[PDB]
Amino acid sequence: HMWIGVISLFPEMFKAITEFGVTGRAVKHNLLKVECWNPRDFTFDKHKTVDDRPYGGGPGMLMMVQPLRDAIHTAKAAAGEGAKVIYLSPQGRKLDQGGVTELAQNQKLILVCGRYEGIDERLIQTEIDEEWSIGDYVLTGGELPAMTLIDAVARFIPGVLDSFADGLLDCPHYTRPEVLEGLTVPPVLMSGHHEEIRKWRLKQSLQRTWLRRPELLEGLALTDEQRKLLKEAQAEHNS
Amino acid sequence: HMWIGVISLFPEMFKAITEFGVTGRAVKHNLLKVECWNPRDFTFDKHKTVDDRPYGGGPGMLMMVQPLRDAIHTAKAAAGEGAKVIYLSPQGRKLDQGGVTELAQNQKLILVCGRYEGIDERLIQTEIDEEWSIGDYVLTGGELPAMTLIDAVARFIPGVLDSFADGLLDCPHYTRPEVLEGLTVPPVLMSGHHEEIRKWRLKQSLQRTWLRRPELLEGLALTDEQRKLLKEAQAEHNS
Numbered sequence: 001h002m003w004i005g006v007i008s009l010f011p012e013m014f015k016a017i018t019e020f021g022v023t024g025r026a027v028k029h030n031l032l033k034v035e036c037w038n039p040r041d042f043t044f045d046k047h048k049t050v051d052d053r054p055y056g057g058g059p060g061m062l063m064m065v066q067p068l069r070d071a072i073h074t075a076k077a078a079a080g081e082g083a084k085v086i087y088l089s090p091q092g093r094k095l096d097q098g099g100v101t102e103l104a105q106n107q108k109l110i111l112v113c114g115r116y117e118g119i120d121e122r123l124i125q126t127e128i129d130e131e132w133s134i135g136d137y138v139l140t141g142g143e144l145p146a147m148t149l150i151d152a153v154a155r156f157i158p159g160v161l162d163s164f165a166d167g168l169l170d171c172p173h174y175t176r177p178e179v180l181e182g183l184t185v186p187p188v189l190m191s192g193h194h195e196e197i198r199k200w201r202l203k204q205s206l207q208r209t210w211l212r213r214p215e216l217l218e219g220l221a222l223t224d225e226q227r228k229l230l231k232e233a234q235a236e237h238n239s
Numbered sequence: 240h241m242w243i244g245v246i247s248l249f250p251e252m253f254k255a256i257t258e259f260g261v262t263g264r265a266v267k268h269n270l271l272k273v274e275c276w277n278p279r280d281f282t283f284d285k286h287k288t289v290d291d292r293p294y295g296g297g298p299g300m301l302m303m304v305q306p307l308r309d310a311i312h313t314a315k316a317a318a319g320e321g322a323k324v325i326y327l328s329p330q331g332r333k334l335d336q337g338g339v340t341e342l343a344q345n346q347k348l349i350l351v352c353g354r355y356e357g358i359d360e361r362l363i364q365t366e367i368d369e370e371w372s373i374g375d376y377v378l379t380g381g382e383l384p385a386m387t388l389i390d391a392v393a394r395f396i397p398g399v400l401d402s403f404a405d406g407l408l409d410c411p412h413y414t415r416p417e418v419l420e421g422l423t424v425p426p427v428l429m430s431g432h433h434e435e436i437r438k439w440r441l442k443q444s445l446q447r448t449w450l451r452r453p454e455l456l457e458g459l460a461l462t463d464e465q466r467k468l469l470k471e472a473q474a475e476h477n478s
């Protein structure tokens with residue numbers, strides 16, 4: 001069971017994870033609960049203003065402090081004690097599978113989604129526990145990053161359901177038909193030999209990591225078998 | 240003008256970008272067009288089967304080849320000549336702002352969204368031009384990655400509308416009120432001095448990059464002004 005509070009100007013976006021696929025089933029079955037608060041609903045002016053001008057000028061707008069702060073405090077009260085508050089931002093800790101495993105240890109999170117140029121620095125200081133980025137690129141809002149985080153952590157919730165699992169890229173996979181545009185399925189996978197198949201998959205994962213993302217292998221303490229299969233793949237490449 | 244074809248089992252997820260915010264306005268105004276095809280609609284069996292068992296066993300399922308291949312070919316025909324076909328996968332090129340700028344050079348892309356354990360390796364060989372990842376973590380499907388890519392590239396389309404822009408994290412931003420939980424807005428930003436403000440923002444970007452993501456600075460050819468402001472920030476830190 002995991003509870004995620006979300007602060008967003010566009011809560012309907014979250015239907016993309018709550019209504020579809022494995023995450024949607026997690027939500028319908030109560031394995032994951034996602035509750036949203038919208039800063040617009042905390043405004044008091046006639047036109048429900050949710051942006052504000054940055055001090056110092058420059059182009060762009062910021063989220064208005066009062067509606068956003070009020071929304072955050074409502075979510076914190078709903079979460080009760082022990083909920084970590086995360087702000088999605090490219091200035092935050094870059095998400096990776098280790099970071100996903102750490103976040104999945106939380107039974108409650110509140111995810112704050114910015115729009116426009118972002119949010120006031122002092123709200124980060126006073127209301128946010130951690131800032132997290134989904135990658136070194138800039139999106140229009142924090143909603144896709146928050147949904148990405150939700151989706152990645154939800155995979156760890158028992159009952160909801162490997163690249164980076166053991167630190168390696170996944171092996172190639174094949175299904176019917178046996179021959180596709182003259183390309184055949186590797187016969188080892190048709191052999192029925194479980195141990196040969198296991199080794200092939202592991203060797204492929206090693207080879208693909210080495211060729212595509214060699215920096216990922218630096219970080220790893222390979223097993224003796226992995227060292228051997230990696231050496232075999234590298235010799236085949238040099239042949 | 241940019242055209243994006245999407246192949247997905249859950250095309251309704253894309254409402255999250257087509258109906259909301261800056262990307263939603265881009266779609267309504269015809270700056271961005273997003274067209275979806277669903278492999279389910281290309282099935283012929285009574286129960287519209289879209290998954291299939293992997294050769295070699297192991298847990299999990301793959302996308303079924305025939306419906307997915309047929310959907311891809313329909314999208315390719317709709318795109319006409321010159322559309323790059325991308326498969327979203329953690330085995331692909333990790334997206335970053337340089338990669339976003341390169342993808343934004345395409346007037347047409349087709350984005351293939353996998354589910355389950357993925358897709359047959361031979362379809363990658365025969366139908367996919369490039370594989371791209373949004374980060375080193377595993378999600379339940381390619382839809383959030385495809386939407387992330389769409390959102391990031393859409394920011395480059397003229398008329399739709401900085402971290403990583405010049406390679407640096409953004410500076411902190413402040414809006415009303417002047418004092419928030421006893422934290423005051425930096426007086427330079429209230430000074431009205433454009434050149435002082437510009438320098439402060441740049442120095443803050445340098446400082447924040449250095450402290451949070453020092454590896455990003457390695458990659459940069461700093462200007463003389465940036466070298467100076469970075470040195471000032473580092474001396475203030477050592478004081």
Ligand SMILES: C[S@@+](CC[C@H](N)C(=O)[O-])C[C@H]1O[C@@H](n2cnc3c(N)ncnc32)[C@H](O)[C@@H]1O
Nearest residue numbers: 088089114117133134138139141142145402409
């Ligand atoms: C246009 S961005 C704000 C851009 C601002 N100039 C900056 O670089 O931080 C709008 C919202 O999307 C969130 N956002 C953009 N890219 C993100 C990313 N890669 N990871 C997490 N959140 C992101 C931001 O933190 C911000 O609240």
Ligand SMILES: C[S@@+](CC[C@H](N)C(=O)[O-])C[C@H]1O[C@@H](n2cnc3c(N)ncnc32)[C@H](O)[C@@H]1O
Nearest residue numbers: 163170327328353356372373377378380381384
């Ligand atoms: C459960 S993942 C497939 C996992 C498979 N064992 C692997 O590691 O490649 C399901 C779909 O989501 C896409 N996906 C998962 N994480 C992604 C990421 N970080 N970037 C892009 N696509 C991703 C996949 O390529 C796949 O088609």
